[PDB]
Coordinates of C-alpha atoms in Angstrom, one line a residue:
Chain A
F437 CA 31.2 19.7 -4.5
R438 CA 33.0 17.5 -2.0
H439 CA 29.5 16.7 -0.6
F440 CA 26.7 17.9 -2.8
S441 CA 26.4 17.7 -6.6
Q442 CA 27.3 20.6 -8.9
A443 CA 23.7 21.3 -9.9
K444 CA 22.5 22.1 -6.4
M445 CA 24.6 25.3 -6.3
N446 CA 22.9 26.7 -9.4
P447 CA 19.2 25.8 -9.3
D448 CA 16.4 27.1 -11.5
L449 CA 13.1 28.7 -10.4
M450 CA 9.7 28.5 -12.1
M451 CA 6.6 30.4 -11.0
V452 CA 3.0 29.7 -12.1
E453 CA 0.7 32.6 -11.5
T454 CA -3.1 32.4 -11.5
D455 CA -5.9 34.8 -10.5
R456 CA -7.6 32.7 -7.8
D457 CA -6.5 31.2 -4.5
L458 CA -4.7 27.9 -4.9
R459 CA -4.7 26.6 -1.3
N460 CA -7.2 23.8 -1.7
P461 CA -6.8 20.1 -2.6
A462 CA -8.3 20.5 -6.1
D463 CA -5.5 22.9 -7.1
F464 CA -2.9 20.8 -5.3
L465 CA -3.8 18.0 -7.7
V466 CA -2.9 20.2 -10.7
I467 CA 0.2 21.5 -8.9
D468 CA 1.4 17.9 -8.5
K469 CA 0.7 17.2 -12.1
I470 CA 2.9 20.1 -13.1
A471 CA 5.6 19.0 -10.8
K472 CA 5.6 15.5 -12.3
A473 CA 5.7 17.0 -15.8
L474 CA 8.7 19.1 -14.9
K475 CA 10.5 16.2 -13.3
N476 CA 10.0 14.0 -16.4
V477 CA 12.0 16.4 -18.6
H478 CA 15.2 14.7 -19.7
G479 CA 18.1 16.1 -17.7
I480 CA 16.2 17.1 -14.6
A481 CA 17.2 15.5 -11.3
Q482 CA 14.5 16.6 -8.9
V483 CA 11.8 19.3 -8.4
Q484 CA 10.8 20.5 -5.0
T485 CA 7.6 22.5 -4.4
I486 CA 4.7 22.5 -1.9
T487 CA 3.7 18.9 -2.9
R488 CA 7.4 17.8 -2.8
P489 CA 8.9 19.9 0.0
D490 CA 12.1 17.9 0.2
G491 CA 12.3 17.0 -3.4
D492 CA 10.7 13.5 -2.8
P493 CA 6.9 12.8 -2.9
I494 CA 5.1 13.3 0.4
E495 CA 4.8 10.1 2.3
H496 CA 1.2 8.7 2.7
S497 CA 0.0 10.7 -0.2
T498 CA -0.8 8.0 -2.8
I499 CA -4.3 6.5 -3.3
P500 CA -3.0 2.9 -2.8
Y501 CA -1.8 4.0 0.6
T502 CA -5.4 5.0 1.4
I503 CA -6.6 1.6 0.1
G504 CA -4.0 -0.4 2.0
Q505 CA -4.9 1.3 5.3
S506 CA -8.7 0.7 5.0
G507 CA -8.8 -2.4 7.2
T508 CA -6.7 -1.3 10.2
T509 CA -9.8 -0.1 12.1
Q510 CA -11.5 -3.4 11.9
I511 CA -8.3 -5.1 13.2
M512 CA -8.3 -2.7 16.1
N513 CA -11.9 -3.6 17.1
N514 CA -11.2 -7.4 17.2
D515 CA -10.9 -7.9 20.9
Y516 CA -14.1 -6.2 21.8
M517 CA -16.0 -8.3 19.2
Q518 CA -14.4 -11.5 20.5
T519 CA -15.6 -10.6 24.0
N520 CA -19.1 -10.2 22.7
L521 CA -19.0 -13.6 21.1
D522 CA -17.9 -15.2 24.4
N523 CA -20.7 -13.4 26.1
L524 CA -23.1 -14.9 23.6
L525 CA -21.9 -18.4 24.5
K526 CA -22.3 -17.7 28.2
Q527 CA -25.8 -16.3 27.7
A528 CA -26.7 -19.6 25.9
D529 CA -25.5 -21.5 29.0
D530 CA -27.6 -19.2 31.2
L531 CA -30.6 -19.9 29.1
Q532 CA -30.1 -23.6 29.6
Chain B
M678 CA 0.6 -2.5 0.1
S679 CA 0.9 0.8 1.9
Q680 CA 4.5 0.0 3.0
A681 CA 5.4 -1.1 -0.5
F682 CA 4.1 2.1 -2.1
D683 CA 5.9 4.2 0.5
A684 CA 9.2 2.4 0.2
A685 CA 9.2 2.5 -3.6
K686 CA 8.7 6.3 -3.7
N687 CA 5.8 5.7 -6.1
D688 CA 4.2 8.9 -7.4
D689 CA 1.6 7.7 -9.9
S690 CA -1.2 9.1 -7.8
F691 CA -1.5 12.0 -5.3
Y692 CA -4.1 13.3 -2.9
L693 CA -3.9 15.6 0.2
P694 CA -7.0 15.7 2.4
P695 CA -8.4 19.0 3.5
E696 CA -7.5 18.3 7.1
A697 CA -3.8 18.4 6.3
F698 CA -4.1 22.0 5.2
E699 CA -4.6 23.0 8.9
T700 CA -1.5 21.3 10.3
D701 CA 1.4 23.6 11.3
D702 CA 3.8 21.8 8.9
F703 CA 1.7 22.7 5.9
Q704 CA 0.8 26.1 7.2
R705 CA 4.6 26.8 7.2
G706 CA 5.1 25.2 3.9
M707 CA 2.4 27.3 2.2
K708 CA 4.3 30.4 3.3
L709 CA 7.5 29.0 1.8
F710 CA 6.2 28.0 -1.7
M711 CA 3.1 30.1 -2.3
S712 CA 2.4 33.8 -2.4
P713 CA 0.7 35.6 0.6
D714 CA -2.6 35.8 -1.3
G715 CA -2.2 32.2 -2.6
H716 CA -2.4 33.2 -6.3
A717 CA 1.0 31.8 -7.3
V718 CA 3.3 28.9 -6.6
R719 CA 7.1 28.6 -7.2
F720 CA 9.0 25.5 -8.2
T721 CA 12.7 24.7 -7.7
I722 CA 14.4 22.8 -10.5
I723 CA 17.8 21.0 -10.2
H724 CA 19.6 19.7 -13.3
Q725 CA 21.8 16.6 -13.8
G726 CA 25.5 17.2 -14.2
Chain C
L70 CA 3.1 6.4 13.9
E71 CA 4.2 3.9 11.2
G72 CA 0.6 3.2 10.4
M73 CA 0.4 -0.3 12.0
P74 CA -2.1 -1.5 14.6
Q75 CA -0.7 -2.2 18.1
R76 CA -2.4 -3.8 21.1
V77 CA -1.9 -3.9 24.8
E78 CA -3.4 -7.0 26.6
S79 CA -4.5 -5.4 29.9
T80 CA -2.7 -2.8 31.9
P81 CA -3.5 -0.8 35.1
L82 CA -4.7 2.8 34.6
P83 CA -3.4 5.5 34.1
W84 CA -1.5 4.5 31.0
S85 CA 0.6 6.8 28.8
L86 CA 2.8 6.3 25.7
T87 CA 5.0 8.8 23.8
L88 CA 5.9 8.4 20.1
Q89 CA 8.0 10.5 17.7
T90 CA 8.3 10.7 14.0
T91 CA 9.8 12.9 11.2
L92 CA 6.8 12.6 8.8
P93 CA 5.0 15.8 7.9
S94 CA 1.5 14.3 8.6
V95 CA 0.4 11.4 10.8
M96 CA -2.9 9.9 11.9
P97 CA -3.0 9.3 15.7
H98 CA -5.7 6.8 16.7
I99 CA -6.4 4.9 19.9
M100 CA -9.3 2.9 21.5
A101 CA -9.7 1.7 25.1
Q102 CA -12.2 -0.2 27.1
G103 CA -12.0 -0.6 30.9
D104 CA -13.8 -2.1 33.8
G105 CA -14.8 1.2 35.4
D106 CA -17.8 3.5 34.9
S107 CA -15.8 6.2 33.2
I108 CA -12.7 6.3 30.8
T109 CA -11.0 9.1 28.9
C110 CA -8.5 9.3 26.1
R111 CA -6.4 12.3 25.1
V112 CA -4.0 12.9 22.2
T113 CA -1.2 15.5 22.6
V114 CA 0.9 16.6 19.5
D115 CA 3.8 18.9 20.3
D116 CA 2.4 19.8 23.8
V117 CA -1.0 20.7 22.3
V118 CA -4.2 18.7 23.0
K119 CA -5.8 17.7 19.7
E120 CA -8.6 15.5 21.0
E121 CA -10.2 14.3 24.3
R122 CA -13.2 12.1 24.6
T123 CA -15.0 10.6 27.6
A124 CA -17.4 7.6 27.8
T125 CA -19.8 6.9 30.7
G126 CA -21.5 3.7 31.8
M127 CA -20.7 0.2 32.9
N128 CA -17.6 -1.1 31.0
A129 CA -17.3 2.2 29.2
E130 CA -15.4 2.2 25.9
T131 CA -14.0 5.4 24.2
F132 CA -11.8 6.4 21.2
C133 CA -9.8 9.4 20.1
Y134 CA -9.3 9.9 16.4
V135 CA -7.4 12.7 14.6
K136 CA -7.5 12.7 10.8
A137 CA -4.2 14.6 10.4
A138 CA -1.8 15.9 13.0
Chain D
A630 CA -45.4 -27.3 53.6
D631 CA -42.6 -29.5 52.2
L632 CA -43.3 -28.6 48.6
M633 CA -43.2 -24.8 49.3
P634 CA -39.5 -24.6 50.1
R635 CA -38.7 -26.3 46.8
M636 CA -40.5 -23.5 44.9
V637 CA -38.6 -21.0 47.1
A638 CA -35.3 -22.6 46.2
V639 CA -36.0 -22.8 42.5
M640 CA -36.2 -19.0 42.1
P641 CA -32.6 -17.7 42.7
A642 CA -31.2 -19.4 39.6
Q643 CA -33.4 -17.5 37.2
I644 CA -32.6 -14.1 38.7
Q645 CA -28.8 -14.7 38.2
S646 CA -29.5 -15.5 34.6
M647 CA -31.4 -12.2 34.1
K648 CA -28.6 -10.3 35.8
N649 CA -26.0 -11.9 33.6
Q650 CA -28.1 -11.1 30.5
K651 CA -28.3 -7.4 31.6
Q652 CA -24.6 -7.2 32.0
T653 CA -24.1 -8.7 28.6
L654 CA -26.5 -6.2 27.1
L655 CA -24.7 -3.3 28.7
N656 CA -21.3 -4.5 27.4
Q657 CA -22.7 -5.1 24.0
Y658 CA -24.2 -1.6 23.9
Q659 CA -20.9 0.0 24.8
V660 CA -19.0 -1.9 22.2
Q661 CA -21.4 -1.3 19.4
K662 CA -21.8 2.4 20.3
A663 CA -18.1 2.9 20.2
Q664 CA -17.7 1.1 16.9
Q665 CA -20.5 3.1 15.2
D666 CA -19.3 6.4 16.5
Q667 CA -15.7 5.6 15.5
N668 CA -16.9 4.7 12.0
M669 CA -19.0 7.8 11.7
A670 CA -16.0 10.0 12.8
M671 CA -13.7 8.3 10.2
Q672 CA -16.2 8.5 7.3
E673 CA -17.1 12.2 7.9
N674 CA -16.1 14.5 5.1
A675 CA -14.6 11.7 3.0
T676 CA -16.4 12.8 -0.2
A677 CA -13.9 15.7 -0.3
Chain E
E98 CA 7.2 -26.6 -36.4
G99 CA 4.3 -29.0 -36.9
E100 CA 1.4 -29.5 -39.3
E101 CA -1.0 -29.8 -36.4
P102 CA -1.0 -27.8 -33.1
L103 CA 1.7 -29.1 -30.7
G104 CA 0.4 -31.4 -28.0
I105 CA 1.5 -33.7 -25.2
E106 CA 3.9 -35.8 -27.3
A107 CA 5.5 -32.6 -28.7
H108 CA 6.2 -31.5 -25.1
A109 CA 7.7 -34.9 -24.3
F110 CA 9.9 -34.8 -27.3
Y111 CA 10.9 -31.2 -26.4
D112 CA 11.8 -32.2 -22.9
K113 CA 14.0 -35.1 -24.1
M114 CA 15.7 -32.8 -26.6
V115 CA 16.3 -30.2 -23.9
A116 CA 17.8 -32.8 -21.6
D117 CA 20.1 -34.1 -24.2
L118 CA 21.2 -30.5 -25.2
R119 CA 22.0 -29.8 -21.6
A120 CA 24.0 -33.0 -21.5
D121 CA 26.5 -31.7 -24.1
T122 CA 28.6 -29.5 -21.9
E123 CA 31.3 -29.0 -24.5
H124 CA 29.2 -27.1 -27.0
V125 CA 26.0 -26.1 -25.2
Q126 CA 26.3 -23.9 -22.2
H127 CA 22.8 -22.8 -21.2
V128 CA 19.2 -23.5 -22.4
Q129 CA 16.5 -21.1 -21.2
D130 CA 13.4 -23.2 -21.3
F131 CA 10.3 -21.0 -21.5
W132 CA 7.9 -23.4 -23.3
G133 CA 8.4 -26.0 -20.5
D134 CA 7.5 -23.6 -17.7
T135 CA 3.8 -22.8 -17.6
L136 CA 4.4 -19.2 -16.4
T137 CA 6.2 -18.3 -19.7
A138 CA 4.8 -20.9 -22.1
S139 CA 2.6 -18.4 -23.8
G140 CA 5.5 -16.4 -25.3
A141 CA 7.4 -19.4 -26.6
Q142 CA 4.5 -20.7 -28.7
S143 CA 2.9 -19.1 -31.8
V144 CA -0.6 -17.9 -31.9
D145 CA -1.8 -20.8 -34.1
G146 CA -0.1 -23.2 -31.7
Chain F
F437 CA 8.5 -16.5 -40.3
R438 CA 5.4 -18.5 -41.3
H439 CA 4.2 -18.4 -37.7
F440 CA 6.1 -15.9 -35.6
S441 CA 7.3 -12.4 -36.5
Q442 CA 10.8 -11.6 -37.7
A443 CA 11.7 -9.7 -34.5
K444 CA 11.2 -12.7 -32.2
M445 CA 14.2 -14.5 -33.7
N446 CA 16.6 -11.7 -32.8
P447 CA 15.6 -10.3 -29.4
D448 CA 17.5 -7.9 -27.2
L449 CA 18.5 -8.3 -23.6
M450 CA 18.8 -5.6 -20.9
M451 CA 20.1 -6.2 -17.3
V452 CA 19.7 -3.8 -14.4
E453 CA 22.2 -4.6 -11.6
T454 CA 21.9 -3.3 -8.1
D455 CA 23.7 -3.9 -4.8
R456 CA 20.8 -5.2 -2.7
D457 CA 18.3 -8.0 -2.9
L458 CA 15.3 -7.2 -5.2
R459 CA 12.9 -10.0 -4.3
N460 CA 10.3 -7.8 -2.4
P461 CA 7.2 -6.0 -3.6
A462 CA 8.7 -2.6 -3.2
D463 CA 11.4 -3.3 -5.8
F464 CA 8.8 -5.1 -8.0
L465 CA 7.0 -1.8 -8.3
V466 CA 10.1 -0.2 -9.7
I467 CA 10.8 -3.1 -12.0
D468 CA 7.3 -2.8 -13.5
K469 CA 7.9 0.9 -13.9
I470 CA 11.1 0.2 -15.9
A471 CA 9.3 -2.4 -18.0
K472 CA 6.6 0.1 -18.9
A473 CA 9.2 2.7 -19.7
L474 CA 11.0 0.3 -22.0
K475 CA 7.7 -0.8 -23.7
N476 CA 6.7 2.8 -24.4
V477 CA 9.7 3.4 -26.6
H478 CA 8.7 3.9 -30.2
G479 CA 9.4 0.8 -32.2
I480 CA 9.2 -1.8 -29.4
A481 CA 6.5 -4.5 -29.6
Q482 CA 6.7 -6.2 -26.1
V483 CA 8.9 -6.6 -23.1
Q484 CA 8.9 -9.7 -20.9
Chain G
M678 CA -14.8 -3.6 -12.9
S679 CA -12.2 -6.4 -12.3
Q680 CA -13.2 -8.3 -15.5
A681 CA -13.1 -5.0 -17.5
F682 CA -9.6 -4.2 -16.3
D683 CA -8.4 -7.7 -17.0
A684 CA -9.9 -8.0 -20.5
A685 CA -8.6 -4.6 -21.6
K686 CA -5.0 -5.6 -20.5
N687 CA -4.8 -2.3 -18.5
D688 CA -1.4 -1.6 -16.9
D689 CA -1.7 1.8 -15.4
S690 CA -1.1 0.4 -11.9
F691 CA 0.6 -2.7 -10.6
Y692 CA 1.0 -4.5 -7.2
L693 CA 2.0 -8.0 -6.2
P694 CA 1.3 -9.0 -2.6
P695 CA 4.0 -10.6 -0.4
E696 CA 2.0 -13.8 -0.3
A697 CA 2.5 -14.3 -4.1
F698 CA 6.3 -14.5 -3.7
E699 CA 5.9 -17.9 -1.9
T700 CA 3.9 -19.6 -4.7
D701 CA 5.8 -22.1 -6.8
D702 CA 5.1 -20.3 -10.0
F703 CA 6.8 -17.1 -8.8
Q704 CA 9.6 -19.2 -7.1
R705 CA 10.4 -20.6 -10.6
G706 CA 10.0 -17.2 -12.3
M707 CA 12.5 -15.5 -9.9
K708 CA 15.0 -18.2 -10.9
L709 CA 14.3 -17.5 -14.6
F710 CA 14.6 -13.7 -14.6
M711 CA 16.7 -12.8 -11.6
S712 CA 20.2 -13.5 -10.3
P713 CA 20.7 -16.3 -7.7
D714 CA 21.5 -13.6 -5.0
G715 CA 18.6 -11.4 -6.3
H716 CA 20.8 -8.4 -7.1
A717 CA 20.0 -8.2 -10.8
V718 CA 17.1 -8.6 -13.2
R719 CA 17.1 -9.2 -16.9
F720 CA 14.6 -7.9 -19.5
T721 CA 13.8 -9.3 -23.0
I722 CA 13.0 -6.7 -25.6
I723 CA 11.4 -7.5 -29.0
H724 CA 11.3 -4.9 -31.8
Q725 CA 8.6 -4.2 -34.5
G726 CA 9.3 -5.2 -38.0

């Protein structure tokens, strides 16, 4: 108790048992939904499971993260495109 | 946008690509939270106070 | 490994860089174009080679992409 | 015999232009090939 | 309150009244002006205007 | 009361006080989350 | 899609880019709802009935 909180010394355990394999993204979506539902209960601090290994959401796992990283590849290719444009100008001079 | 959603610890949406299921970190994690045949998953719950 | 693009102006080959992170999953990604007839990239995660690609021809350009590592 | 050397001296300029165009074409091919292959690698299995 | 929807002259009168209210330091301490600012003017005014 | 609703003449005020500067997008996400939570309470018309 | 989400007043997600924090409208708004040092934010709540 000098370092942790009291609740971490007496945690609870819940198991959800199905009949089919759950190691695919489609079932991971439902697992995350269940984890959020459990966390939203009044009086619960945090829930850790496969989608929240350390109790916090996995980084780089939101849809807006995927959206916000969509344009980095175009930024990476910029130099090689600028070189092509300069080559176009020099080719025009050669034509002259 | 990506940095903001990471810093805020937002959890409105979630998605894990199939390629992440082959990394060693998630290979170890699925042996820590899921049954050997993958039919069950366990949750750890911590109260307040 | 923070998910931001970085660039190197022009450096003599061979070139190497080592990065470290604590995140469960990252997306290594790199491109390179040289003045030689052959160029190769290689990505190593925890002393394991994840990707290696070679391009051939004048002013060859290559890339190494790993979706999750 | 004075006109012929002029025609001889005209030629070299055009060949240099063709060589530069060939170099530009090779560089453009490399750049666009890399871009297309990179995009196809990233977009593969994205409908998952 | 007005018989007709409040217009430019209403805003001028409102601004003058707000300035004079802020002048009286002894009684008035703070006036949060939402109708003056365009970002929040929608809330401070009724639907009929 | 002829134009507005009764509740607009007697509003409530809530303040959330932290120790760090909050004028960045990352904190604005949490502020919007709090605003939605307050609005979803039964009996609340709007939060600004 | 954009017009549909604007007309319906949808609020499932939210994001404000860093560039918006420099506009005068949000420069005024942050002096209207946040403390001068930016450590606190106030909310206005209106009941029903």
